[PDB]
Amino acid sequence: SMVYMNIMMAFTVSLVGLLMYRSHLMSSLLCLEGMMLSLFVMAALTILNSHFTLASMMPIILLVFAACEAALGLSLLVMVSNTYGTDYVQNLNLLQ
Amino acid sequence: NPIIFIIILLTIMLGTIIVMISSHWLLVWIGFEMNMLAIIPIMMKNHNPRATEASTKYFLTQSTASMLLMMAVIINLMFSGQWTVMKLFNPMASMLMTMALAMKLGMAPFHFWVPEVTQGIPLSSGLILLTWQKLAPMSVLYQIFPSINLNLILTLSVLSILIGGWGGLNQTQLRKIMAYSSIAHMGWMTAVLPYNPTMTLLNLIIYIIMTSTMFTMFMANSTTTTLSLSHTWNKTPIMTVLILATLLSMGGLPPLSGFMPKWMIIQEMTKNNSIILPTFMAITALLNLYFYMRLTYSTTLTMFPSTNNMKMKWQFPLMKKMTFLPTMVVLSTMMLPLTPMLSV
Amino acid sequence: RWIARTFFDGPEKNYERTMAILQIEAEKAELRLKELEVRRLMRARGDGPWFHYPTIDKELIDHSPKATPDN
Amino acid sequence: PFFDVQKRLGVDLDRWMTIQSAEQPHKIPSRCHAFEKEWIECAHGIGSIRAEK
Amino acid sequence: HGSPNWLKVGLTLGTSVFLWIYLIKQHNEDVLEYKRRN
Amino acid sequence: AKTVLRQYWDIPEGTECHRKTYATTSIGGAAGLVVSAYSVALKTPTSFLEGVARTGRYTFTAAAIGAIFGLTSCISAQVREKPDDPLNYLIGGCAGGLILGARTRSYGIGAAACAYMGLTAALVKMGQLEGWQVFAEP
Amino acid sequence: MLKYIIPTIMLMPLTWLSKNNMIWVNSTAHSLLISFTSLLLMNQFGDNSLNFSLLFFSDSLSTPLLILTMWLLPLMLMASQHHLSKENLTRKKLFITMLISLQLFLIMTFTAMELILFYILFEATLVPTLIIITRWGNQTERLNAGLYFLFYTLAGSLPLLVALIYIQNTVGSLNFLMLQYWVQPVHNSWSNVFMWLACMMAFMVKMPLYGLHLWLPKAHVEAPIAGSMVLAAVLLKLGGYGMLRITLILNPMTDFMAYPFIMLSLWGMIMTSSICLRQTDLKSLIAYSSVSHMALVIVAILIQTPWSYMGATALMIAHGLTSSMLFCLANSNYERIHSRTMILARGLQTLLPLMATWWLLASLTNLALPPTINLIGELFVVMSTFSWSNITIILMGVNMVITALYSLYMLIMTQRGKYTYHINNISPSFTRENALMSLHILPLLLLTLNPKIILGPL
Amino acid sequence: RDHWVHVLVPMGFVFGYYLDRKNDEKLTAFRNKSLLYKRELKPNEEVTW
Amino acid sequence: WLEAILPKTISLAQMKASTLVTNQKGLIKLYFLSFLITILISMILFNFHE
Amino acid sequence: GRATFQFLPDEARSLPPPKLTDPRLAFVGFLGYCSGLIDNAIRRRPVLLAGLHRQLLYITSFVFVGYYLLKRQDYMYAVRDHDMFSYIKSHPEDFPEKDKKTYGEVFEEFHPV
């Protein structure tokens, strides 16, 4: 019913100017690691309100990578700001 | 170190074998979710301040590319509530599939990327592995094949083979020149795709070979165009007849095999009485040729041998399976009306 | 007289050798008109095993008496 | 290209989680369960291109 | 005293001795199959 | 969407020349936006009001052409025989292209616009006139 | 048939397989022999044309045209020898290979049995020619002749393959010309013009109209040593005959639009020969002949009604020789004096007396004295194209004037006193100079004795 | 040695000229035509085909 | 005037490959804002939802 | 077709098979026979005939493989046909029998010059 239009307007959290930008990359990477819960919850209802009884594990597997992988891509964000000290998306150097 | 590099480099194809083998929407997520997990360290190996400002412009551009998909999987879990792998039962699914999946392949838009990564990965060794990621997605599009809005997958095609064409005429670095005109050949195979989707793969294999045999040749030291001038008077001239026996065949001219995909593809795209589409593709791959000419006027014109440069030593690279391919990348046209009935 | 019988032949070959290879032909324009009257246009039937697609496998369904009286 | 190995040899990779009615370990149904075995019964020997119509 | 490996040399020869043998082993067998089947 | 054509291609067909440049300033006026979308996105435009102004200017510039183009035809599409014909409907191209050439001075453009944007007008009508299809299925 | 492709491919390892300098004489010796095979089974019918295989009728067609194609090969190594002796043998082994690699397809083409072997072999050159132009050029303007030679030839010949694949699946099978015995016509539409226009314009871009010839003098002015492939590229061009296989049929009944190809090339025929009078570079001066009385065939072919094919065939092989041989003179006289500027060479005819009668018999066959093939190839043009409309007698009657001032001005420029400063030009035309310059005027005039062997079916 | 390089190659001819004779046996399929064109009673049609 | 009209094609295109490279240089923000225009503009435009 | 992910099924028994001396199988590995000669030449062998143990084992490979692959190709064009006639045979309503008319009948255009 209504709970399917919220949360959906929430899953436009993408909003992409705020997905790569502006600086403090950690804000961009943040709205990514919370782009989940729009994928999770939304898929923790349709599975639940009707009894699938089987795909019920799927919600668990939507995290176990969403944490595993998104925690990888954090790593690079040390390598960027190790050599700098400010992330600041404004580093372009490799060009085209 | 050296063992694992064969554990990693094995897990990739295991990432893409669960893609082609599966019945089940979840697995085609996990399947090419663990490439963006298992690709990344290969970029690194020499730990430089590009690869690390490269794979981070790659990462978050294949992160959402995936993470939209999972939103267009769980739409038709609502409607019809049957996973598996077949037409998507609802238009907001497909239009959120195909034009958010074009990110991994990148098509007509969604490429400010393919030149920003392929350029300036310090590792040119390969970078032949960016011929896998052409091969994971297609092994969805062949299945979903009878659902597309059909006004799109052409509209990303025809805005592609154009936009990847003009992209390079302005380029010098020859890692880019392959980066460009590798959007191009993504224009032919997904322009066909709703009509008779085999005779796509035909263009897919003939592509994996030709771009393959380039790099293995571009591996000795070769990097910048004006380091391919110092080539024939230095390294070996039997190399130059090679790089002229392919770069020409790759845009294609009928006595070679590079003419083999077009010649067959248009048998298909007319006979469906669309004859005003293919000319414009057929005619646009023309000025896709003027990279290669003017690339090939670098090496046969004896241009100012580098300097006093004396390489008296022989070679010890791995040419592995290069001593085959440009007898199959060239001479196969005379052979085959198989490719339409062989893989089918 | 000497040459014609030394080298080539008359209309016992280059005539009625064309008779020969135009039955290697007019059967090649019979079978390119029946693809395009079948392949391209099957059509709405999807009858013959050509445009045939996967649907679902009714083997994996279950008939047993699962527990809830109404379902 | 979809090879379908799990058809040739014996293993089940997935094929179980797939649809709304298969097992459900203690045999408990879904709400719309009874309409699956109705709708799959319709299109099976079909080739799905006439199924839609 | 030419110095190849004298380890592998002859494998490629020996291997082809297998292949053509095995090739015709499948061929000289399969030829009759057509007639055995037809 | 696709239908803007559908009422464009149905009713007027050579007559009611006022609605025919009424709806055919929409298209060439519509596509002016999309170029104004990548203009400031892909090219920088640091200007609160200045930027806005620049954008608008470019957009309107692009827009000019669709308006006259419907008109330069259905006028002459009315006045000769009162149908439209593969020659008749060219005319909107050359003078129509000259608007662009009238802008950002000619000598190397105004001919080409009149030339090529001339060449590619006729095909449209000539296209449906023989029943051509760009995007089809068996 | 394989009687031909097999020995001529057997030639291919007759060359490198040989020793040092024996190579030239090795292959020139054999390459002549094949000419016995050339005639051998050929010059059979005649009536009810020869087709000896499924996908080959070598040439029956009364377009024999193939005997020449097998001439010009061992006229090259006598031609090409001059400055190619100055680089390495493994490269000299190449230049003889690709040059053959051309000769192998021109035997494949002109037979082809069909349309679709023609095309892929109609485009199958430009791999071997383009490589001879760019390497072994002279000036540095060559690099542009590389492109311009493509981007026309290939530019519009792709619309063939859109059209010829459109016919294959429309009416029956194009697999064979010799079955047109079902052909419906082409009446009219805004679609069919294009069909006729797509099945045509690819051919025009080879034998030039007065538009889109912009490449022809670009490639010839600057082009390999001897005219080594410049003799071959004067075979390639005329080989656009295939318009004779199409326009006879396969849309017969549109002549409706012929007129923009008539009045466009018919006023160029009176034209580009006239822009050839003030030329200061000699290998340009001949390059514009080659347009002119070649472009007369395009008004011979479009018109139906034989007495044109009587006269249109004799022309393809008319200048096939004369226009060949002139590029052989202007080469030689260039060996000695290294400018191609026409002015510079004057005061000859004293110093090379025997080569006097060589210029003359060449420049006399553009004049087309009545008895030779040239006029009997032009006066079947004028007889039908007169009946078209009486007024064609004027322009193409003017062609017969400006061309006479045209030719002489090239000879009579080499009759003057000049001793001037040249200490060069000693060599009194060592035999190859006058040997390879023969094997043209001997075979050319000769045919006038029994000139029923050059004619179409009509 | 004996110069295999030389005229051994012209033997390619009769090599080939035989191949043009390989087909005539499979092109036999019409011995019957009205244009004389007979293959009527004679031991002539019998040869060459 | 034969060489103006056709080689105009040469210096026609070779300029448009200066607007597809020069003006795209850098600024990872600037791409990403432009995938968004593209992903909405596919909604309103055409068949894509129909 | 059926028996999916099979190189070839059991039904291919009834095909000739494609035995040797066909030009292709000879040609197959010819393009390898010009491949072997390369294999030397890249490294400055500089033999142009080097060890026959590399200069062979190619020719062995191709024609075997070229052969073992041509066995299924010819198959596929058979199952293509077989599924056509058997459809063309039924639904004769979609397959008319055309009548026979010589020319006492047809007019053409008729447009001479």
Taking CB atoms and an 8 Å limit, are J27 and B335 in contact across chains? Answer: yes
H or E, element range at A81: helix A76-82
**Residue G342 DSSP label:** G
Q: Are G17 and G49 in contact (CB under 8 A)?
A: no
CATH code: domain of residue A73: 1.10.287.3510
Domain annotation covers residue A95: no
Neighbours of A55 (CB within 10 A): 19
**Both structure tokens of C10:** 């008359």
Domain annotation covers residue A25: yes
Q: In three state form, how does the secondary structure of F16-47 look?
A: CHHHHCCCHHHHHHHHHHHHHHHHHHHCCCCC
Within 8 A of G121 by CB-CB distance, chain B residues are 254
Please, what is the angle between helix A58-74 and helix B25-38, to 10°? 20
CA atoms within 13 A on the CB side of F118: 15
Within 8 A of G17 by CB-CB distance, chain H residues are 5
Residue in G253, G255, G304 closest to J109 by CB:
G253
Taking CB atoms and an 8 Å limit, are C16 and H30 in contact across chains? Answer: yes
**Residue G165 DSSP label:** H
H or E, element range at G98: helix G89-108
Neighbours of J16 (CB within 10 A): 11
Select the residue from C6, C8, C13, C16 to test the H interface by mutation, using most H Cβ atoms within 10 A: C16
Neighbours of G73 (CB within 10 A): 24
d(CA B235, CA B315): 9
Taking CB atoms and an 8 Å limit, are A17 and I29 in contact across chains? Answer: yes
The residue of chain I nearest to residue G152, with distances taken between CA atoms, is: I6
Instruction: Give the residue from G378, G230, G368 showing the smallest Cα distance to G299.
Output: G378
d(CA C39, CA C9): 45
Give chain F's count of helices (H) and strands (E): 7, 0
Within 8 A of C38 by CB-CB distance, chain J residues are 84, 87-88
Within 8 A of D15 by CB-CB distance, chain C residues are 60
Instruction: State the residue range of the domain holding A52.
Output: 2-84
Domain annotation covers residue A72: yes
How far D7 CA sits from the closest chain J CA (Å)?
Answer: 8
Contacts (Cβ under 8 Å, ≥6 apart) of G353: none
Residue in J83, J88, J91 closest to C49 by CB:
J83
Instruction: Compute CA distances B194 → B138, G296, I49, whole Å.
Output: 13, 48, 18
Instruction: Give the residue from G447, G320, G313, G311 showing the smallest Cα distance to G379.
Output: G311
Q: In Å, what resolution does this model reach?
A: 5.0
Instruction: Compute CA distances C27 → B338, C21, C33, G172, I35, whole Å.
Output: 21, 10, 10, 10, 55
d(CA C10, CA C12): 5
Domain annotation covers residue A91: no
Contacts (Cβ under 8 Å, ≥6 apart) of J101: none
d(CA F48, CA F51): 6
**Both structure tokens of B246:** 């392919």
Instruction: Give the residue from B254, B261, B283 showing the smallest Cα distance to B207.
Output: B261
**Residue I49 DSSP label:** G
Taking CB atoms and an 8 Å limit, are G158 and B286 in contact across chains? Answer: yes
Instruction: Give the residue from G207, G209, G316, G319 showing the smallest Cα distance to G258.
Output: G209
φ, ψ (nearest 5 deg) of residue D32: -90, 15
Neighbours of J38 (CB within 10 A): 16
Residue G155 sits at the vertex; the CA angle it makes with G237 and G269, to the nearest 5 degrees, is 45
Domain annotation covers residue A93: no
Q: Are G328 and G227 in contact (CB under 8 A)?
A: yes
Neighbours of C6 (CB within 10 A): 7
Domain annotation covers residue A90: no
How far B95 CA sits from the closest chain I CA (Å)?
Answer: 6
Transcribe B104-130 into DSSP letters: TTT-SSS-SSHHHHHTT-S--S---GG
Count: domains in chain A: 1
Instruction: Give the residue from F133, F111, F128, F121 showing the smallest Cα distance to F24.
Output: F121
Q: Are G68 and G118 in contact (CB under 8 A)?
A: no
Domain annotation covers residue A20: yes
Instruction: Give the residue from G458, G366, G352, G353 showing the smallest Cα distance to G410.
Output: G366
Q: Are G211 and G201 in contact (CB under 8 A)?
A: no
Taking CB atoms and an 8 Å limit, are C12 and H44 in contact across chains? Answer: yes
Taking CB atoms and an 8 Å limit, are F37 and I41 in contact across chains? Answer: yes
Within 8 A of J5 by CB-CB distance, chain D residues are 3-5, 7-8
d(CA C25, CA J33): 35
Residue with tokens 């490198």: G16
Select the residue from G38, G39, G40, G50 to test the C interface by mutation, using most C Cβ atoms within 10 A: G50
Touching D (3+ Cβ pairs <8 A), the chains are A, B, C, J
Select the residue from D12, D19, D20, D28 to test the A interface by mutation, using most A Cβ atoms within 10 A: D20
Alpha-carbon torsion (F74, F80, F81, F84), positive or negative: negative
d(CA I43, CA I45): 6
Within 8 A of F138 by CB-CB distance, chain C residues are 40-41, 43
Residue in D15, D20, D32 closest to B23 by CB:
D15
**Phi-psi region for residue A12, left (φ > 0), alpha (ψ -120 to 50) or beta?**
beta
Q: Are G216 and G148 in contact (CB under 8 A)?
A: no
**Residue C60 DSSP label:** S
Touching C (3+ Cβ pairs <8 A), the chains are B, D, F, G, H, J
Residue with tokens 């005619």: B283
Contacts (Cβ under 8 Å, ≥6 apart) of J47: J40
Count: domains in chain H: 1
Q: Are B45 and B123 in contact (CB under 8 A)?
A: yes
User: What ranges in chain B are assigned the alpha helix state H?
Assistant: 4-20, 25-38, 40-44, 51-73, 75-78, 91-101, 114-118, 138-144, 155-158, 160-163, 165-168, 174-179, 185-192, 201-218, 237-243, 247-251, 260-269, 278-284, 296-299, 339-342
**Residue C10 DSSP label:** -
Q: Which residues on neighbouring strands pair with residue B173, listed in sequence order?
A: B224
